[PDB]
Write a protein that binds this DNA or RNA. Sequence first.
RNA 1: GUCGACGUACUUCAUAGGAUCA
RNA 2: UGAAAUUCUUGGAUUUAUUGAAGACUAACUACUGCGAAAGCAUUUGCCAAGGACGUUUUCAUUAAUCAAGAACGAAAGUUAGGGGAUCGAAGAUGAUCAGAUACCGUCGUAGUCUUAACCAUAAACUAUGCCGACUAGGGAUCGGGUGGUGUUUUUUUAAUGACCCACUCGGCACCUUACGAGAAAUCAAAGUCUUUGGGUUCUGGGGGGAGUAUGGUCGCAAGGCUGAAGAC
RNA 3: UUGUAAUUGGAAUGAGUACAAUGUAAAUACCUUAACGAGGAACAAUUGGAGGGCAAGUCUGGUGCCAGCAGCCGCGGUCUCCAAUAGCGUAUAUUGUUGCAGUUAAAAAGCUCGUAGUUGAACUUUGGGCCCGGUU
RNA 4: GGAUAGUGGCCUACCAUGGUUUCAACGGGUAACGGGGAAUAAGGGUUCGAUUCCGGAGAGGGAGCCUGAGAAACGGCUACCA
Lengths: 134, 49
Amino acid sequence: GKGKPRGLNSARKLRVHRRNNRWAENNYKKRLLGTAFKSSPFGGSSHAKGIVLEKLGIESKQPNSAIRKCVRVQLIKNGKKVTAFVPNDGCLNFVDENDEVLLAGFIPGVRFKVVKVSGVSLLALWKEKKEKPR
Amino acid sequence: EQSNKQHRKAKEKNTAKKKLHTQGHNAKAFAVAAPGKMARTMQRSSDVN
RNA sequence: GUCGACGUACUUCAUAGGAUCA
RNA sequence: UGAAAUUCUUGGAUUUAUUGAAGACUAACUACUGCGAAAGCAUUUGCCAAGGACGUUUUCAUUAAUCAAGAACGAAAGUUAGGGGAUCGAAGAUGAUCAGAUACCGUCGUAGUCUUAACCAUAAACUAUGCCGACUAGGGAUCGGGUGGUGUUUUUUUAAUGACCCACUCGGCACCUUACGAGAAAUCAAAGUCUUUGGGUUCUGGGGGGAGUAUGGUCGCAAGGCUGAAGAC
RNA sequence: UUGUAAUUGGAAUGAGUACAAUGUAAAUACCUUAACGAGGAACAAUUGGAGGGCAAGUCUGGUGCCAGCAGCCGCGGUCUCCAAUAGCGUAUAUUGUUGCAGUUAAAAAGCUCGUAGUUGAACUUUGGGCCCGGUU
RNA sequence: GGAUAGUGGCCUACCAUGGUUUCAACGGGUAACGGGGAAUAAGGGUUCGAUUCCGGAGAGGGAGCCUGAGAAACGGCUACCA
Ligand SMILES: [Mg+2]
Ligand SMILES: [Mg+2]
Ligand SMILES: [Mg+2]
Ligand SMILES: [Mg+2]
Ligand SMILES: [Mg+2]
Ligand SMILES: [Mg+2]
Ligand SMILES: [Mg+2]
Ligand SMILES: [Mg+2]
Ligand SMILES: [Mg+2]
Ligand SMILES: [Mg+2]
Ligand SMILES: [Mg+2]
Ligand SMILES: [Mg+2]
Ligand SMILES: [Mg+2]
Ligand SMILES: [Mg+2]
Ligand SMILES: [Mg+2]
Ligand SMILES: [Mg+2]
């Protein structure tokens, strides 16, 4: 005996035992209860819109440093302040205060990067293929 | 130099099957039929929102 | 009110051992 | 006491002896040996019922194993109402606050410790080890019963019993050796059942240890409104 | 005998243009096809990653001449390689019936009784003697 | 007995006290139309299926009807709600 019923007519005890024990899994619990998106950085979304409050590392002396590429952004969905990466200081010129920035998951502690500014791809602006509409 | 072996205390933290009843209601009762469509539909709506 | 408990989500500390050589 | 000091004391303390009273507890014998489902259980004698094991060429014939619901008991502490109140003693008070192996010591001691009628139902409630069934090594010690001997002691009339010695058999707490197997190891006759897995059944877990951070969540959580110091010359 | 060509020769061809015809209800397109249509064949293939080198240049630090960061900015003057390929990149998401474990690091309930549920000893025509037709 | 195209607590009158349930009724959730199917997996399984076919329901929300063999129809009608 393994501590589990084995009789040919004991199907029900096995099913009811399984259904009760399946809730132990954190993955299972999150999936059915729809709580798997609390841990998501954006609260379930793949991208986040934000307002550029300030360019923190604008005054850093060393060019192209990690600090120079960080911007403090307000998430419009909830108003929480977060920090985002820009691909390079050259791209930082495009970003200025009080524009919409679309953020995506990525100086430890910075977990976001800017992918679109003012509704235009930041990569496109860097490649000189578009103009930022103001 | 005498180091006694720790007494691993019996759990007082709520078990995984007990945590589900700590809130106001029984969390297991309020669950959807097809969680697969929950995750897919919810993610799309979040970006639309 | 930088209040308590719980739930949830994350961070963090504990990894070196044998042989040869100088 | 490390030394003191609260304390008692020429109205005689401490100590001696002859008693008397009160309430607990059953030393040494005492051993993880014995009994009980466990928690637990130890002075003598009586009564009441209960129980394992052993013996049976007695009796019924599947009446059985496990167990959600439900029920009885459940160490110590604790609550309600009486009784009792010796010792010890949470709390409280008080002496001293000098010295680090003796660094937490002393005195008074409320509740409790005991008991009666109900509650509370928690322990490292431990073999940190579910229950029933089968099988898989040798060895001698013990507890209860039973069988056997032309064995010792005893009955000091015999004897028969009782107590011992030896062999074995059932059941039990157990213990040594074991390249039998298992395990990383400690170790285990079960934590074993020839490489990876099925004799029956109940319960539990989905990861541990030591630190933190935040919280669109849940349940909770105060007081305050007439009060005013100044050695040098 | 290896690599590099804004070197060089004449052969081929469709993207595109277009008589015509086919196609279609009428058209467009396809398949056909006179005539044009290639050397930077400029008729100008992309998406990602990795690694350099350069200055009378700039910043920072120090056991001198150095090291780190990095370098579209200097006195005047108006580069290499790797992967996929008409496709490539980024972000989020993405329990054991067979077959788990419970002494020493998750988890055996303090003990017993007990309903449902699951499971539950053995035994009843076995053996023997012939006949037929099938396969390999 | 009435009604129905018709069986039937479908409804009416009188009667009895029945019916389901730990073999999970009743109640709650369902980002629940159901199926043929789709994905993955070595096998068991796990998930998806509004969506080319079949069947059901609806035409902003309830309620009620004429016509007609066939409708509680809505590119038919009437009220109420918005
Ligand atoms: Mg077994
Ligand atoms: Mg005894
Ligand atoms: Mg009392
Ligand atoms: Mg009780
Ligand atoms: Mg004990
Ligand atoms: Mg056994
Ligand atoms: Mg075309
Ligand atoms: Mg039964
Ligand atoms: Mg049988
Ligand atoms: Mg629906
Ligand atoms: Mg579905
Ligand atoms: Mg469908
Ligand atoms: Mg309709
Ligand atoms: Mg509409
Ligand atoms: Mg209608
Ligand atoms: Mg219509």
